[PDB]
């Protein structure tokens, strides 16, 4: 299988900025390369064929280049409608193979998250399970580290997190993290804490509560 | 919400053509898995020659009806790893196989039974407060959430669901509001899980 590697995985860019993203094949693919664009919640749309030709209707601010193993897609002047995920694909040989995609997002100023922690409800505790939830609200950029500590012991393997898409009006993200324990375990400890490290904060922010 | 199949089971997808001459094009199936990777599934030339990746060879069959203008995907021995959005696509020549993208279909392969969610309050802590609802243990996707029947939209964030190890989904919805209004205002989250015909309302208030 011809491996397609895209770089970078994501990047922030400003309106009007010149943007270039890259795709590398594990071998020569003779310019048999498509580029696709996918907006959140939408079907992909095909922009480029043969590495450098635009499909009918594709805006001229788009262009492609490269040959052999090394290719690129350039947007000469970024518009708001251009945010989304960009994928490459080779059709030189079977099997047809995609790159993992490059995500283009809108650049803005740093914004530190507001952090909230929520204990489990009494109603949930009657089911034998306890969920503790940590909210990071309206921050930028997306990268953040969230740690759970129970009576100050770092937790691992018992949490899941999820993140919103970039907000259409302030370009921030929000993140939810859920710590899940049995009722028995939850009742066996006192201090529950969520600790957040982010570029916009000058020290980690910890929100906590005491069971009871 | 979409087709549901038990592991090992069978399914037939169909894609009816409109707005082009179906018999002129190579037709393909492509899927997008929960981690948003795209993967080629099958192709068939205008004359009926088929092409497959090894991951589905022997399990899936692509076929076409050039008289009724319909594309088919017959799936056998389905695996939980086949869970995805499935797209129909058409192409030809140097455009490639995926020049234009068609009708999508969600396919979920899981042993889980359809189940409505439990809804628990995320209670505002003892000038801005956050509150919400945890929508837990439902199957399949999706659920919808609104606040105060749609009257409250500002500052609302509803997160993507996560798949738990139990095979059931979980998600939270939150909103930020003035602390001042915690006394005078009533905040209710409205949950709808159409696949199980379940509607739940939860009033979220300071403990």
């Amino acid at each position: 299988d011809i491996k397609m590697t895209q770089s970078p995985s994501s990047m922030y860019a400003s309106l009007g900025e010149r943007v270039t993203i890259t795709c590398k094949a594990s071998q020569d693919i003779n310019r048999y390369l498509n580029w696709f664009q996918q907006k959140p919640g939408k079907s992909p749309k095909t922009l480029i064929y043969r590495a450098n030709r635009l499909l009918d209707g594709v805006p001229s601010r788009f262009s492609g280049s490269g040959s052999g193993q090394d290719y690129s897609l350039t947007i000469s002047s970024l518009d708001y409608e251009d945010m989304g995920i960009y994928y490459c694909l080779q059709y030189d040989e079977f099997p047809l193979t995609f790159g993992d995609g490059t995500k283009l997002e809108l650049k803005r100023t740093v914004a530190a998250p507001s952090v909230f922690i929520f204990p489990p409800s009494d109603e949930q505790l009657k089911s034998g399970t306890a969920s503790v939830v940590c909210l990071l609200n309206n921050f930028y950029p997306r990268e953040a580290k969230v740690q759970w500590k129970v009576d100050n012991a770092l937790q691992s393997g018992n949490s899941q997190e999820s993140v919103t898409e970039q907000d259409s009006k302030d370009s921030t993200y929000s993140l939810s993290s859920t710590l899940t324990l049995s009722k028995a375990d939850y009742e066996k400890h006192k201090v529950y804490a969520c600790e957040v490290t982010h570029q916009g904060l000058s020290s980690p922010v910890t929100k906590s509560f005491n069971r009871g | 919400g979409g087709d549901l199949v038990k592991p090992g089971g069978s399914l037939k997808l169909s894609c009816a053509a409109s707005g082009f001459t179906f018999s002129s094009y190579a037709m393909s199936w492509v899927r997008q898995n929960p981690e948003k990777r795209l993967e080629w599934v099958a192709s068939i030339s205008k004359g009926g020659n088929t092409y497959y990746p090894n991951s589905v060879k022997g399990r899936f069959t692509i076929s076409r009806d050039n008289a009724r203008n319909i594309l088919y995907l017959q799936m056998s021995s389905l695996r939980s790893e086949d869970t995805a959005l499935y797209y129909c696509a058409r192409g030809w020549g140097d455009y490639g196989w995926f020049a234009y993208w068609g009708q999508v279909t969600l396919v979920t392969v899981s042993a889980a039974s359809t189940k409505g969610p439990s809804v628990f309050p995320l209670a505002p802590s003892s000038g801005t407060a956050a509150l919400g609802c945890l929508v837990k243990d439902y199957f399949p996707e999706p659920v919808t959430v609104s606040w105060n029947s749609g009257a409250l939209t500002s500052g609302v964030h509803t997160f993507p669901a996560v798949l738990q190890s139990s095979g059931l989904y979980s998600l939270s919805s939150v909103v930020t509001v003035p602390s001042s209004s915690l006394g005078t205002q009533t905040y209710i989250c409205n949950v709808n899980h159409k696949p199980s015909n379940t509607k739940v309302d939860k009033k979220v208030e300071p403990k």
């Binding site: 030189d92 | 190579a26 030809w92 020549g93």
Partner: peptide
């Protein structure tokens, strides 16, 4: 007006 019969993509093997 009606789309003619079109070549299969050139992908090899």
């Amino acid at each position: 007006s009606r789309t003619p019969s079109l070549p299969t993509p050139p992908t090899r093997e």
